[PDB]
Structure formats: C-alpha cells, structure tokens
Design a protein around this motif. Structure first.
Motif, PDB file in Angstrom:
ATOM      1  N   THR A  46       3.694  -2.862  14.040  1.00  0.00           N
ATOM      2  CA  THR A  46       2.699  -2.175  13.222  1.00  0.00           C
ATOM      3  C   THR A  46       3.136  -1.993  11.771  1.00  0.00           C
ATOM      4  N   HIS A  47       4.421  -1.732  11.526  1.00  0.00           N
ATOM      5  CA  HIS A  47       4.934  -1.507  10.182  1.00  0.00           C
ATOM      6  C   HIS A  47       6.328  -2.110  10.068  1.00  0.00           C
ATOM      7  N   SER A  48       6.645  -2.639   8.886  1.00  0.00           N
ATOM      8  CA  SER A  48       7.960  -3.217   8.623  1.00  0.00           C
ATOM      9  C   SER A  48       8.180  -3.300   7.118  1.00  0.00           C
ATOM     10  N   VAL A  49       9.430  -3.574   6.736  1.00  0.00           N
ATOM     11  CA  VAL A  49       9.809  -3.793   5.344  1.00  0.00           C
ATOM     12  C   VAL A  49      10.619  -5.078   5.234  1.00  0.00           C
ATOM     13  N   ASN A  50      10.576  -5.680   4.050  1.00  0.00           N
ATOM     14  CA  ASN A  50      11.314  -6.897   3.740  1.00  0.00           C
ATOM     15  C   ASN A  50      12.514  -6.566   2.863  1.00  0.00           C
ATOM     16  N   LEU A  51      13.668  -7.135   3.205  1.00  0.00           N
ATOM     17  CA  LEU A  51      14.923  -6.812   2.544  1.00  0.00           C
ATOM     18  C   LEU A  51      15.476  -7.943   1.689  1.00  0.00           C
ATOM     19  N   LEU A  52      14.807  -9.091   1.630  1.00  0.00           N
ATOM     20  CA  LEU A  52      15.335 -10.279   0.977  1.00  0.00           C
ATOM     21  C   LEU A  52      14.426 -10.706  -0.168  1.00  0.00           C
ATOM     22  N   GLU A  53      15.036 -11.059  -1.297  1.00  0.00           N
ATOM     23  CA  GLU A  53      14.325 -11.503  -2.489  1.00  0.00           C
ATOM     24  C   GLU A  53      14.518 -13.002  -2.681  1.00  0.00           C
ATOM     25  N   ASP A  54      13.429 -13.702  -3.009  1.00  0.00           N
ATOM     26  CA  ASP A  54      13.479 -15.157  -3.069  1.00  0.00           C
ATOM     27  C   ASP A  54      12.723 -15.758  -4.248  1.00  0.00           C
ATOM     28  N   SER A  55      12.496 -15.017  -5.329  1.00  0.00           N
ATOM     29  CA  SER A  55      11.722 -15.522  -6.452  1.00  0.00           C
ATOM     30  C   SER A  55      12.409 -15.201  -7.774  1.00  0.00           C
ATOM     31  N   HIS A  56      12.208 -16.086  -8.749  1.00  0.00           N
ATOM     32  CA  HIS A  56      12.697 -15.915 -10.110  1.00  0.00           C
ATOM     33  C   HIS A  56      11.637 -16.435 -11.072  1.00  0.00           C
ATOM     34  N   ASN A  57      11.839 -16.182 -12.367  1.00  0.00           N
ATOM     35  CA  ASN A  57      10.846 -16.552 -13.369  1.00  0.00           C
ATOM     36  C   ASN A  57      11.130 -17.876 -14.070  1.00  0.00           C
ATOM     37  N   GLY A  58      12.351 -18.395 -13.986  1.00  0.00           N
ATOM     38  CA  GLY A  58      12.640 -19.734 -14.460  1.00  0.00           C
ATOM     39  C   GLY A  58      13.010 -19.871 -15.918  1.00  0.00           C
ATOM     40  N   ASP A  70      12.779  -9.463 -21.009  1.00  0.00           N
ATOM     41  CA  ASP A  70      13.944  -8.648 -20.723  1.00  0.00           C
ATOM     42  C   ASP A  70      14.116  -8.626 -19.212  1.00  0.00           C
ATOM     43  N   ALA A  71      15.350  -8.434 -18.759  1.00  0.00           N
ATOM     44  CA  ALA A  71      15.632  -8.468 -17.333  1.00  0.00           C
ATOM     45  C   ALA A  71      16.875  -7.640 -17.046  1.00  0.00           C
ATOM     46  N   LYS A  72      17.111  -7.391 -15.759  1.00  0.00           N
ATOM     47  CA  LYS A  72      18.323  -6.724 -15.307  1.00  0.00           C
ATOM     48  C   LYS A  72      19.341  -7.687 -14.717  1.00  0.00           C
ATOM     49  N   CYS A  73      18.897  -8.849 -14.246  1.00  0.00           N
ATOM     50  CA  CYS A  73      19.770  -9.847 -13.652  1.00  0.00           C
ATOM     51  C   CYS A  73      19.425 -11.221 -14.208  1.00  0.00           C
ATOM     52  N   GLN A  74      20.444 -12.064 -14.350  1.00  0.00           N
ATOM     53  CA  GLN A  74      20.253 -13.426 -14.828  1.00  0.00           C
ATOM     54  C   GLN A  74      21.027 -14.388 -13.942  1.00  0.00           C
ATOM     55  N   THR A  75      20.358 -15.453 -13.510  1.00  0.00           N
ATOM     56  CA  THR A  75      20.958 -16.520 -12.720  1.00  0.00           C
ATOM     57  C   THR A  75      20.809 -17.831 -13.481  1.00  0.00           C
ATOM     58  N   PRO A  76      21.530 -18.889 -13.101  1.00  0.00           N
ATOM     59  CA  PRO A  76      21.319 -20.188 -13.758  1.00  0.00           C
ATOM     60  C   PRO A  76      19.915 -20.745 -13.594  1.00  0.00           C
ATOM     61  N   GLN A  77      19.136 -20.249 -12.635  1.00  0.00           N
ATOM     62  CA  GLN A  77      17.769 -20.710 -12.412  1.00  0.00           C
ATOM     63  C   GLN A  77      16.724 -19.869 -13.131  1.00  0.00           C
ATOM     64  N   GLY A  78      16.896 -18.553 -13.166  1.00  0.00           N
ATOM     65  CA  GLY A  78      15.929 -17.676 -13.802  1.00  0.00           C
ATOM     66  C   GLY A  78      16.339 -16.230 -13.637  1.00  0.00           C
ATOM     67  N   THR A 115      25.635 -14.836 -10.803  1.00  0.00           N
ATOM     68  CA  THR A 115      24.729 -13.855 -11.385  1.00  0.00           C
ATOM     69  C   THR A 115      25.434 -13.100 -12.504  1.00  0.00           C
ATOM     70  N   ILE A 116      24.638 -12.580 -13.436  1.00  0.00           N
ATOM     71  CA  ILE A 116      25.128 -11.708 -14.501  1.00  0.00           C
ATOM     72  C   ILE A 116      24.186 -10.519 -14.620  1.00  0.00           C
ATOM     73  N   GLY A 117      24.744  -9.307 -14.582  1.00  0.00           N
ATOM     74  CA  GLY A 117      23.969  -8.089 -14.697  1.00  0.00           C
ATOM     75  C   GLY A 117      24.022  -7.269 -13.417  1.00  0.00           C
ATOM     76  N   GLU A 118      22.961  -6.498 -13.190  1.00  0.00           N
ATOM     77  CA  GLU A 118      22.806  -5.698 -11.979  1.00  0.00           C
ATOM     78  C   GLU A 118      21.921  -6.473 -11.010  1.00  0.00           C
ATOM     79  N   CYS A 119      22.522  -7.011  -9.960  1.00  0.00           N
ATOM     80  CA  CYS A 119      21.881  -7.975  -9.082  1.00  0.00           C
ATOM     81  C   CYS A 119      22.079  -7.599  -7.624  1.00  0.00           C
ATOM     82  N   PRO A 120      21.192  -8.065  -6.738  1.00  0.00           N
ATOM     83  CA  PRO A 120      21.423  -7.897  -5.296  1.00  0.00           C
ATOM     84  C   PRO A 120      22.561  -8.766  -4.782  1.00  0.00           C
ATOM     85  N   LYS A 121      22.828  -8.695  -3.482  1.00  0.00           N
ATOM     86  CA  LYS A 121      23.889  -9.472  -2.859  1.00  0.00           C
ATOM     87  C   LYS A 121      23.347 -10.806  -2.363  1.00  0.00           C
ATOM     88  N   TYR A 122      24.178 -11.842  -2.441  1.00  0.00           N
ATOM     89  CA  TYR A 122      23.756 -13.191  -2.091  1.00  0.00           C
ATOM     90  C   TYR A 122      24.130 -13.528  -0.653  1.00  0.00           C
TER      91      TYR A 122
END
Ligand SMILES: *[C@@H]1O[C@H](CO)[C@@H](O[C@@H]2O[C@H](CO)[C@@H](O)[C@H](O)[C@H]2NC(C)=O)[C@H](O)[C@H]1NC(C)=O
Ligand code: NAG
Ligand code: NAG
Ligand code: NAG
Ligand code: NAG
Ligand code: NAG
Ligand code: NAG
Lengths: 119, 213, 119, 109, 105, 119, 52
Positions: free
Chosen positions: A28-40, B1-9, B24-31
């Motif tokens: 019914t409810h859950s949270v996601n702990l993993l990030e997989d996106s960047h701006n490039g 502006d950002a808090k974390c920087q990677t070679p990709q974005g 990574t550079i900055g305040e980032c999560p764990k890989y």
C-alpha cells in the motif's frame, strides 16, 4: 442482528518490494532510496564556477603553453575539469619529473597568484 | 547551481544512495551497484504471515476505510459505516518512522573522493588502488541490499501482529454477550445502538449491564 | 521540535508565492502540519494541512482551488504555494504542528511567522 | 462560526470567564481548544480536549464545555495575562475545517 | 509487543517477585504470596547467555597496529594509507551499531 | 567446565586476603557459584554464593559482615575477600558450581582448593 | 538504565550490560614487565646517529 467487524486498509497502488521469502509483493505504501538521474552539465558549486582547461592539460596550463594563454585570467575556482584526451601540454619533447605528485599537490589548491619572480 | 557534481552531470537529491558515478565532488549520496532499493511502509495490498491474521482468518482489505490502517465496520438498526482506530495507527506510524530515520542515520559517511594517476613504472600501486576501491564498493553494496531485504520482512510481520492484537483486544471485551462467526465479525445477542458501538470502539464496554438481554 | 520558515516576500498582484517550513529532528515525521495566516487586526485563520505517510491534503473551502501544499520528506520540508495574489493576501503566515497524524483543532507547536505583502 | 464576547476586563486577583458559543455542528459534537496570543508572538495553546492543559500551563487556567457553549476561566489574574484569547474547534459536516472564534480581548486595569 | 502479553493484557510488573523473571501470585484461605517459575527463568537465562557469548566471540581479530611516515614526494601513498584506515573504521563502526540495535529488539 | 583458583597465601593476623576463581568456557555463565572452606580435621562449610545476571549474593550468618563476594563477568572471574583474619581462618578453600542459576544444596563441579595460613 | 532499539528510543529495562570502554590512566606503563625506551628531546635520527 447487530454486527461489528475488524479489518484493514487497501487502495489501488501497484508498487512492489523484495522480501527474503518472496519476490514482487504489492504493498500500500513505500519509499524509494536510490537516485538515478542527473542534468548532464557542469554547474557551479557554492556560487563559484570551475576552471575548464579545454584543450590544455595540467602540464600545458602550469608551464604556459602558448595556446592556453586565455586561462591566465582565472585565479580562483571550485574544481578543475579536464577532457579525456587533451591535445596540448608540453610542446617541446622531454621528461617531466614527478608530474603525478604535482597533480596531487595541485588538487588541493583553491587559488594562486601569478607573479614575475625574475623580470 | 548544485550541491553535487559528477563527471556526467550535477545532482540535487536528499536520497541516501545513488548509482550514477563513483567519482563525486560536494555533498553527495553513497554509490552502489544496485538497480532497485525500495522500502515498504504500509501493508500487503489485497483489494479483494507469522501471526495468521492478514490473508489468514481475515481474508481481504477494505478500500472504504481511508483514514487509517486498521479499524472497524459496524451495522445496527440506524445504519452502517467504517471507522479507524487512531491509537493503533499512531503506534504503528511511530514505529515505522523511527525505523526509517534510524536507517537513514546509520548510512552517512565522508565524501568528495577523486582518483589518482600513475606512470608506466608504477603498476603495482595502481593495482592496489583499484583493489581497495573495488573491495569497499562491494562491501557497501552488500550491506545496503541485505539491510533493505531483511527489514522488508519485519515490517509486514509487525502489521500482522498489530491486526491480531486489535482483534483479540476486542474479543476479550465482549466475552459471552456476542457470538464469534470466525471471519473477524461478532454478532450481538442484545441490541447495540450507536452508544454501545461507540463504547466498544472506546475500550469501556459495560459487560454486566448488557448480559444477553 | 522547532519550525523555521522562509524569508518575507513582497510581490505584485496576480502573481504566485511559495513559502517553505523546515522542522528539526529526523527527516520523517509522525505528525501532521498545517498552514495558518493572520491579517492585521484579525484573528487566526486555517488554510490547509498535510498528513504523513498517507500524504493526503485538506484545504479550507475559501482557499480551495488556488492553494497547493506539498511535502519533501527526505529533507523534512513542507511547501505552500498560493496563486492569483490579490491585495487582501498580505498577512503573516505560520506553519503549525499537530499532536498526532490527523488534522484536528489542536496545534501545540507554532513557528515565528513570516510576512507576505501584495502591493 | 464561533461567537465570543468582544472584550472582558477585570481587576488583578479576580477570576474572569470567557464564553464561546456556536451551533451543534462545531461545539455540540466536537472538542474545544483555547489559545492565548500576546502582541508580536504566535498563539499559545492553553486548553485542549475541552478541559485539559499541556505542560507549563498554570493551575489558574481552566476550561469546560456544556452543551453548545464552552467556557474558559482565569483565576489569580495578573498583568501579564492581558492578551487575546481564541476558541477553536473541528467543524465537520460539508467539508471539515478548523474554525477559530472571533476573539476576546482581555484588559487589566 | 509482538505477542501482546507484556504491557498488554498483563498491565504491569511485580516488585515483590525478586527470585526470577516470571512467576505466580496465589491467594487462598491460608494466605497469599509470590513465587517464581524456575524452568522458564532457566531457559531464558540459557538463551541470553548464549547470545551474549556469541556476540563477544564473533568480534575478535588482530591488534597492535601503528602508523607509518612519508616524505614530501610521497603524498599519494599517504592518501591511500589514510583512505584504507578510514574505510575500515567506518565499516566496523557500522557493524557494531547495527548488531546491537537489531539484537535489542 | 574446570575451575582454577589462585595460589596459596600466608598472612598475618588482622589483615585481609582476596582469592579468585576462574572458569573455562564462555565468559558469561548460567549457573551460580559458591565458596566453601574446610579446616583440618573437620567437614566442609558453606560461606556464600553469587547468582548470575541478577547479581545477588548470599552469605552464612557466621561469616556475615566480613566476607565480600564479587564477580567480573567479561573475564569470567569470581573474587572472595575476607577481612579481620584470625588464627582459626587457616584452611583449604574451594569454589564450587551449582546445577542451576540458584544457590542450593547441590554442587556438581568442584575446584582443587587452595590453602590459606594465618600465623 | 535505557537501551535503543530500531522501533523506539530510551526504553527503561531491568538488566543490561555495557560493551564500550572509555577510560585510561594517563601514563606510559610497562608491558610484560619491561619498560619502554623514551627518547625525550631526541628523534630516531639523533638516537641512531649518536647526537652529543
Ligand atoms: C540544485 O541545488 C543547488 C544547491 O542545493 C541550488 O542552488 C541554489 O539556487 C538558488 C536559486 O533559487 C540560489 O538562490 C542559491 O544561492 C543556490 N545555492 C547556493 C548554495 O548558491 C539549485 O537551484 C538546485 N537546482 C535546481 C534546478 O533547483
Ligand atoms: C486510485 O484511485 C484514485 C481515485 O480516483 C486516483 O486518484 C489514483 O490515481 C488511483 N491510483 C493510481 C495508482 O492510479
Ligand atoms: C510482478 O507482478 C507483475 C503484475 O502484478 C508482473 O507483470 C511481473 O512480471 C511481476 N514481476 C516479475 C519479476 O515477474
Ligand atoms: C580543441 O581541440 C579540438 C580537437 O582538434 C579542436 O577541434 C578545437 O578547435 C580546439 N579548440 C579551439 C578553441 O581551438
Ligand atoms: C468514550 O470514552 C470517553 C473517555 O474514556 C468517555 O468520556 C465517553 O463518554 C465514552 N463514550 C461512550 C459512548 O461511552
Ligand atoms: C530518557 O528518559 C529520561 C527520563 O526517563 C529523560 O529525561 C530523557 O530525556 C530521555 N531521553 C531522551 C533522549 O530524551
Ligand atoms: C627538551 O626540550 C625542552 C624544551 O626546550 C627543554 O626545556 C628540556 O630541557 C629538554 N630536555 C633536556 C633533557 O634538556
């Protein structure tokens, strides 16, 4: 006859989680702990832009390659970005002594001043 | 502006993990090398267990009960309706939020790590550096996956236990003034108006007064 | 528990303004949060609230249609967005916490309040 | 809406009561809370669950509710008690929403 | 509680029962009194001591470790040494805290 | 399980002597431990005992007031301290283990015993 | 005494043990009956070279 029943909640969610005794399992409810996106892009950290070497390497930047003369204006940075296969470092063939140690030393410098030691 | 920087974005995220780039550079999560890490906070969805209550002698859930996790459905001469038990839901919410906060807190370390360089006559040092990096990454990936998998099991059993305890609490209040029909419901021998129903959900049901008509 | 809100705002009629509230302690909370506003020379006035885990939002009938309340739980922040800013919307704004997970009449912890002016 | 007397005044050392009257939709079927507000400060919860106080509220503040009307009472009145007092309740019929009273301004002489 | 007995349908504990963990209180025409169940307490003590001994045994490794020194042209080796030390310390701190927190439950 | 005691002692009257007993196996025990003494030409004599986890100590009425029994659990050691040493306190001392966690009349494992002389 | 669990904090209990040590005596002591070598004002280079 009057009746009372005990029960629990349900909705229309379609999220699944993994369990050591079973896989999938809709909940019914859950949270996601993993990030997989960047701006490039390369963007600013703490309001300061990085130093981009472009076609130059650390050797060409620190030795004064004639094609890196546009990098002399920038004297403070938040980090240094380099291309995978830089094209101009040492334009005259030879050996650079303790080059990797110099890179390690320069990786903890935030600013410097370029001055004429011998006019 | 950002808090974390990677070679990709660049990244804004408050999540504890990422799988974009190890540098990574900055305040980032764990890989980690993982592709999915989801933590359950609710119950099994049956819109149709160690303790035998959920998907047990109570067969399915209620989509008409929306204000909580556990509750009651009543029926008397004045009508029917759903209601939720606030104390049970509050205790469950306290426990679940504490668990998630503890998990988040235990997984915070240092960051801002970048690679080194070596020349052609320094291959042993390069190999040692690579071995250290790979070993640490493997260990942390194993830790994260095992923790999530093991806590997902305990959350569902916690919910099952809560449902069973509520059922027994209600059962031991009515004693022999009601009949147990075995599916989670009770039929009253006497007449139970809205006040008697409220008293049952209250915890202060008067057994001597209603002694079977 | 301490609640801290974002700075004061001066905006033009017809625009939209978004404020935020940040709570101390663990990022995930077991209580509900509501937004209240007070105009000069008037009593307090409830706007709407948000419920943890379930994520359901309640709004007042007068503010319905132009108020949006959102939550970001991994940073512990709650946002309120107001649109179609008329002249009467200048007031002090508070974020208040409830005793339990449900939106009710009892708020035990209040913020300091921030001013929004619409001139 | 809930209705209170606009203003009440009394002497130091007196006991004074503030009334909050409405309909059977707000007070006739729900609990009542009482808040205190000093100039330049956020409201402070005085009474909840129709007669109960949080930690830090003195004995001299008391509350009760009979039928439709709810009463707040302050004994041993002090100069620091000059403030605005509000009653609040959970109106619940069309779409439930927290309702505050009109407010009562207490003055000490 | 998962089983609903302690702080459940039995509301509180007894300060008059001092010789064990679980027991009885009786009352008849000759008087009243407290007593403890020895078999239940013995089984619980067996289990708890086994658990603590296992925890102690699983956390024994080597010791007597001292630091190194490097000169001005050996900063990469110094950084690698520091990284290794920090990583091992972080892992063991996490292990200890997680184990204690999970067994207390 | 094997019990080993500290070495023999020769002490002057009026002083205090402390002996120790060490048990094999895991540091934490699930049985009680008692101290017994035997003078030449006499039968055994119970002095006191200590109970695991609860940590409660029992003493004989004659030795009450001048005997102290302590335990250090992370090393598996039990200490007995005797004060105001008179001439009659010269004897052999044993540490004995019980079948369960309670101090009773059944001791199944005994040590080798050590001698204390008061001259 | 109080112990932390994953579902709750504080929690008073009847019996517990402590697993962490946090005290020292503040001196340099003997190990296995042998005293250490204290250099004082000298370093390893001065000790091994024979500084006057
Ligand atoms: C990603 O995060 C950074 C920092 O966490 C954000 O940078 C801030 O942007 C605001 C613009 O509204 C500036 O006023 C702040 O000064 C910036 N922070 C700092 C430290 O300078 C950035 O906006 C975020 N990216 C996006 C798209 O929201
Ligand atoms: C479940 O139904 C509600 C009510 O229409 C809807 O808002 C929601 O989007 C539905 N859930 C999903 C996952 O679509
Ligand atoms: C999980 O369930 C969905 C439908 O409920 C199904 O399509 C999917 O294949 C399942 N997962 C796996 C790994 O099979
Ligand atoms: C950088 O190097 C690339 C590689 O040949 C070249 O095409 C480009 O023109 C260079 N940039 C400038 C500004 O000359
Ligand atoms: C429910 O319980 C409260 C307090 O326990 C009591 O004041 C109230 O009268 C009860 N309601 C009914 C219908 O018995
Ligand atoms: C634990 O309880 C004590 C009193 O029982 C209290 O003073 C203390 O603040 C509590 N711990 C925390 C972290 O609040
Ligand atoms: C070691 O150095 C300190 C600091 O100058 C000095 O006071 C002391 O006398 C030196 N030791 C000896 C043995 O002289």
């Amino acid at each position: 006859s009057d009746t009372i029943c005990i029960g629990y909640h349900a909705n229309n969610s379609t999220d699944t989680v993994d369990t050591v005794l079973e896989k999938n399992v809709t909940v019914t409810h859950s949270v996601n702990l993993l990030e997989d996106s960047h701006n490039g892009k390369l963007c600013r950290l703490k309001g300061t832009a990085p130093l981009q070497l472009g076609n130059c390497s650390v050797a060409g930047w620190i030795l004064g390659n004639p094609e890196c003369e546009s990098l002399f204006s920038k004297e403070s940075w938040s980090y240094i970005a380099e291309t995978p296969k830089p094209e101009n470092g040492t334009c005259y063939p030879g050996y650079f002594a303790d080059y990797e140690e110099l890179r390690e030393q320069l990786s903890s410098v935030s600013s410097f001043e370029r001055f004429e030691i011998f006019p | 502006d950002a808090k974390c920087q990677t070679p990709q974005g660049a990244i804004n995220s408050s999540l504890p993990f990422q799988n974009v780039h190890p540098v990574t550079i900055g305040e980032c999560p764990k890989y980690v090398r993982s592709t999915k890490l989801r933590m359950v906070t609710g119950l099994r969805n049956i819109p149709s267990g160690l303790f035998g209550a959920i998907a047990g002698f109570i067969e399915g859930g209620w989509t008409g009960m929306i204000d909580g996790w556990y509750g009651y459905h009543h029926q008397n001469e004045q009508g029917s309706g759903y209601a939720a038990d606030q104390k049970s839901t509050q205790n469950a919410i306290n426990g679940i939020t504490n668990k998630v906060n503890s998990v988040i807190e235990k997984m915070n370390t240092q960051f801002t790590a970048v690679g080194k360089e070596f020349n052609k006559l320094e291959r042993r040092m390069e190999n040692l550096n690579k071995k250290v990096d790979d070993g640490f990454l493997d260990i942390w990936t194993y830790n994260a996956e095992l923790l999530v998998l093991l806590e997902n099991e305990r959350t569902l059993d916690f919910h099952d236990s809560n449902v069973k305890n509520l059922y027994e609490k209600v059962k031991n209040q009515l004693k022999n003034n009601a009949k147990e029909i075995g599916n989670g419901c009770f039929e009253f021998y006497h007449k139970c108006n809205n006040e008697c129903m409220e008293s049952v959900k209250n915890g202060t049901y008067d057994y001597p007064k209603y002694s079977e008509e | 528990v301490q609640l801290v809100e974002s700075g004061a705002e001066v905006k033009k009629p017809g625009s939209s303004v978004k404020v935020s509230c940040k709570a101390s302690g663990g990022p995930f909370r077991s209580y509900a949060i509501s937004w209240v506003r007070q105009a000069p020379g008037q009593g307090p006035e409830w706007m709407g609230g948000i419920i943890p885990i379930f994520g359901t939002t309640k709004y007042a009938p007068k503010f319905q249609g132009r108020v949006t309340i959102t939550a970001d739980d991994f940073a512990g922040t709650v946002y309120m967005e107001l649109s179609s800013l008329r002249s009467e919307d200048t007031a002090m704004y508070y974020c208040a916490k409830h005793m339990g997970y449900q939106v009710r009449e009892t708020m035990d912890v209040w913020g300091k309040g921030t001013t929004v002016t619409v001139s | 809406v809930l209705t209170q007397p606009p203003s009440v005044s009394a002497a130091p050392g007196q006991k004074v009561t503030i009334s909050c009257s409405g309909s059977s939709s707000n007070i006739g079927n729900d609990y009542v809370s009482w808040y205190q507000q000093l100039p330049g400060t956020a409201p402070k919860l005085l009474i909840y669950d129709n007669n109960k106080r949080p930690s830090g509220i003195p004995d001299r503040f008391s509350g009760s509710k009979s039928g439709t009307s709810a009463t707040l009472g302050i004994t041993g009145l002090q100069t620091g008690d000059e403030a605005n007092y509000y009653c609040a309740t959970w109106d619940r019929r069309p779409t439930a929403y927290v309702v505050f009273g009109g407010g009562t301004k207490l003055t000490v002489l």
